[PDB]
Amino acid sequence: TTQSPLNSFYATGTAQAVSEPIDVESHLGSITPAAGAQGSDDIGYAIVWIKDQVNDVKLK
Amino acid sequence: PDKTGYTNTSIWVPGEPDKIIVYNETKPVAILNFKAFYEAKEGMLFDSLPVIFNFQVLQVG
Ligand SMILES: [Ca+2]
Ligand SMILES: [Ca+2]
């Protein structure tokens, strides 16, 4: 009568990667010496947000 | 001005206390005092010629 191939069974899921691993927002400052002067000053900072299940980051 | 030694202190030209340069503020300053030793030429009469000094910065740190 009917001979089934016994293959018509399926299960399906989805995957996505919609975000980059890091986000960088800058809060740097300024360097204001006189002409030819020597000095040092703190510039500011830069926030590096870490995204989903990211544990170690290697940057350049 | 916000320290013990510099409460209400001034800076003035040496030997001339009435010429105050800095008063209760932070202003790095240097004072150069000029003194002349001269021999006028015999018989020369002159009125208003200038004496000119030029300063040239060479290095800064
Ligand atoms: Ca220099
Ligand atoms: Ca991870």
Tell me the nearest-neighbour CA distance from B21 into chain A, angstroms.
22
Of A50, A1, A46, A6, which Cα lies nearest the Cα of A25?
A46
- Mutation site, B56, B57, B60, interface A, largest A CB count within 10 A: B60
Instruction: Tell me the resolution in Å.
Output: 2.6
A40 lies within 8 A of chain B by CB:
no
Tell me the nearest-neighbour CA distance from B56 into chain A, angstroms.
14
| C-alpha separations of B2 from A27, B7, B23, B24, B60 in Å | 31, 7, 13, 9, 28
Q: Which residues contact A2 (CB under 8 A, 6 or more apart)?
A: none
- Asked if A38 lies within 8 A of B59 by C-beta distance, the reply is no
| Residue/partner pairs of B7-15 with CB below 8 Å, 24 or more apart | none
Question: What is the number of the ligand closest to the CA of B57?
Answer: 1
Q: Which residues contact B23 (CB under 8 A, 6 or more apart)?
A: B10, B11
Chain A CB contacts of B60 below 8 Å: 34-38
